[PDB]
Structures are given as C-alpha cells and as structure tokens.
C-alpha cells in the first residue's frame, strides 16, 4: 500500500537511500527490492511485532514468485513512530543493506541481478525521500 | 521512460522536492503528476529544442485520458548538462512550481486534486532525488 517505484535502474556501486516513517504503533514494515514484485533481490521485512516475531528483521529473496530461504538478521534497530534511513547497494555476489545506528549486512544476490528496477514499501513505514548515488 | 511512483500520497500544503540531471543535448524532458498516469494535474514539459519549440515550457492537464488545454509559461531557467530541482505544492485553486533561478507559476488544479500519488519522469532529465516535506 506504501511508494511503488520503477524504472530505478539502480546499477552496481550506486548506491540508493531511503528515508521515512515508521508508524507509531507499527506491527512491522516491508522494502522490496528487485526487477518487479514476482522477482525481488531483497525483501526486507522488520518486524516490531507480527507472526509471533518480536523485534526482528526478517529478510528473503523471491525468484518467479517462489520464496527463498528466509533468514533472521543479528539487530533490530528500529524504533516505532521515528524516522530512519536504509541504504542500499550491489554487485554481481552481495547486496549490502546500511541500517540506522551504523549497523550493516550483506545479501546474496540470489537471483543474479545486474541492475535494480523495482522496489516497493509496505506496511507502517512512509517513504518521504529517495535518492541515488 | 524515467522514474515512475506510485503512491506518494502527497497532501496539500507538502512540498515536493525534485532534483535531477539534465542531459548534454537534451532535447526535452517531462514530469508527470497526478492522481495516475491518465489523470494528470500537471504535465510539465521543458523544451530546449523540441517540436518547433525552443527555451520553452509547456504544461497541461490530462483527465481520463483527455489532455487539457495546453499552457504555455514565459521562462526558461534550464540548461543542458546540468542539474536542476523543481519543487511543487498544491492548494484547491492552483498548483505551485518552484523553479531554479527563483522563478515561479500557478498552474489551476484543473482535476480538483486532494492529493497528488503519482510522478513520472520521461526525456532527457534523470531523476537523483526527490523527497516529500
């Protein structure tokens, strides 16, 4: 339901910023990074409280449509109703995902991807401010 | 085809900012806004040399489809190879748009626009940032 954004064309080494707001009384938030929604490098998913999960960034890949392994990262640091900024860049092995409080962590590239064209927010984060470097 | 957003949920009195590069030999650009890709409040068309047209901005209004009257506007504070930020607010009358080299125009919010949840960037102007506040 949140910004839905293509033609990207974010390429390796650029690097892309997104600044927005979490919810007051959020439950969790997604990014979705990709080529469109059936095809995503990165589907990143913190969640404050949602399917028994508290407090945890829960991230996946999808490759026509069929999810990847799911995996738990190590910090969650995120805040309800607050502002907060994710960076992202890539290349051909990783995507390295830039957290608030200096915190970072890379994703395989699964699906191979030579440039980013997609990417979609959902749940209680509003994007205010997107830009590419 | 440039960026293109979809819900951006920008509500009167917002300001969104949009900053870009324009090419070397750019021949024009465009900056759609709206509600959806065919009910646009403002069709902004920066021409350097386009379609007889020279230093020229043209703007119109697209409701289901159907392109309003075209307007056209009496400055042109752009220039190729260079980057250039417009800034755009709305009230019930009119919208607003800032451009570089403190100029300014009133285009009628034609369509009775509430919010505006709709951008897209086509030509020669690549889209580095843009931002909602």
Redesign the interface.
């Known amino acids: 339901?949140?910004?839905?954004?293509?033609?990207?064309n974010l390429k390796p080494g650029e690097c892309l910023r997104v600044r927005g707001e979490v919810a007051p009384d959020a439950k969790s938030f997604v990014l979705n990074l990709g080529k469109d929604s059936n095809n995503l490098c990165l589907h990143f998913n913190p969640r404050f409280n949602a399917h028994g999960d508290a407090n945890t960034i829960v991230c996946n890949s999808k490759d026509g449509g069929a999810w990847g392994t799911e995996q738990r990262e190590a910090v969650f640091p995120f805040q309800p109703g607050s502002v907060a900024e994710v960076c992202i860049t890539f290349d051909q092995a990783n995507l390295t995902v830039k957290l608030p409080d200096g915190y970072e962590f890379k994703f395989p590239n699964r699906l191979n991807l030579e440039a980013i064209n997609y990417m979609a927010a959902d749940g209680d984060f509003?994007i205010?401010?997107?830009?590419?470097d």
Chains 1, 2 share one sequence.
Do not use: H, I, M, R
């Open positions: 339901c949140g910004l839905v954004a293509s033609n990207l509003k205010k401010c997107v830009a590419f």
